[PDB]
């Protein structure tokens, strides 16, 4: 029972060897490249031999018995909500590239996966969602509007509200004429032939969308997989009360500035906007 | 690991009269006339789950 300090005088059982981070500056010659993650420190602490010293001297422990004490550390980080390190800044998502007229009467539609990038800093779950969509817009303002695709058929859009609370089982349209303004839970709205990649993104968990079997690599979720979750179109309100036969059946096609909701046909009530929240507890659970 | 986070919304009852305007459609408050089938008055101190 004696811990040798080489000099001074050995102390008996129950001793303390501190390993602080305030000693890195003094060791100027070892941590001259690494920042607080894998730095070297002097667990000597004599108090008169200047900053760094006693590199050759070792804190002895007897050969007859082995020691083994506690380790009550004190960690403290400052890692942002989004950064290149944790892989939360980038997230892929196949969006429309162009859409012109070629072949005479044909209409070719091209789609290509594009890796997006978010800025370092901004926190809060709502603010991150708005930024994920802000990246979808900046992509359109550099490739989209210059080639062909309109502001209407913009693929990929993250939301939070339930697009089926005002839906009536008879008419088939959202009677309020406006989707209920009240968020419930984040998801991923998609248009024909477009999805979102999350194999190299932890932003999937943030939205609250995990796989029942996370051990399988590949979090691909295209539009073809969201069968049975069509967003019910709105009801023509300015026509329903005006006429008062009744309009009812007639859904809202255009609006202010004129932007078509992309209806599947002239007869049906649903649109080409597949929702994730609606495909969960509203579709077929089998 | 599910807890209870005690809050405090003095805006209650008064936010109800404003939320009907923040949202575009009175879904919950479909009967703003009837004094029984109306929207339940928002109670003070809202408790919400927090995975700790």
């Amino acid at each position: 029972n004696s811990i040798r300090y080489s000099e001074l005088a050995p102390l008996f059982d129950t001793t303390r060897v501190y390993l602080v981070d305030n000693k890195s500056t003094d060791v100027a010659s070892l941590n001259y490249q690494n920042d607080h993650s894998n730095f070297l420190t002097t667990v000597i602490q004599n108090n008169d031999y200047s900053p760094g010293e006693a590199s050759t001297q070792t804190i002895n422990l007897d050969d007859r018995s082995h020691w083994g004490g506690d380790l009550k550390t004190i960690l403290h980080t400052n890692m942002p909500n989004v950064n290149e390190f944790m892989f939360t800044n980038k997230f892929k998502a196949r969006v429309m590239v162009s859409r012109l007229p070629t072949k005479d009467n044909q209409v070719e539609l091209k789609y290509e996966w594009v890796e997006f990038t978010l800025p370092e800093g901004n926190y809060s779950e709502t603010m991150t969602i708005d930024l994920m969509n802000n990246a979808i817009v900046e992509h359109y303002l550099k490739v989209g509007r210059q080639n062909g695709v309109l502001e209407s058929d913009i693929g990929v859009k993250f939301d939070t509200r339930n697009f089926r609370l005002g839906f009536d089982p008879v008419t088939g349209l959202v009677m309020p004429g406006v989707y209920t303004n009240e968020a419930f839970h984040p998801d991923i709205i998609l248009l024909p032939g477009c999805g979102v990649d999350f194999t190299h993104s932890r932003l999937s968990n943030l939205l609250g969308i995990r796989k029942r079997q996370p051990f399988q690599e590949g979090f691909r979720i295209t539009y073809d997989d969201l069968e049975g979750g069509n967003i019910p179109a709105l009801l023509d309100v300015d026509a329903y009360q005006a006429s008062l036969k009744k309009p009812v059946i007639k859904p809202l096609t255009e609006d202010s500035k004129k932007r078509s909701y992309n209806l599947i046909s002239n007869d049906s009530t649903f649109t080409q906007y597949r929702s994730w929240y609606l495909a969960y507890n509203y579709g077929d659970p089998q | 690991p599910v807890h209870s986070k005690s809050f405090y919304n003095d805006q209650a009852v008064y936010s109800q009269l404003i939320r009907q305007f923040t949202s575009l459609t009175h879904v919950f408050n479909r009967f703003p006339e009837n004094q029984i089938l109306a929207r339940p008055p928002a109670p003070t101190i809202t408790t919400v789950s927090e995975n700790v």
């Binding site: 009536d168 009677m175 309020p176 004429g177 309100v237 009360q241 009744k246 | 459609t25 479909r30 009967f31």
Partner: peptide, 13 residues
């Protein structure tokens, strides 16, 4: 006017 069908949702005004 039809006659029997109240959306049951104060759409007005």
């Amino acid at each position: 006017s039809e006659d029997t069908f109240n959306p049951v949702y104060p759409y007005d005004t």
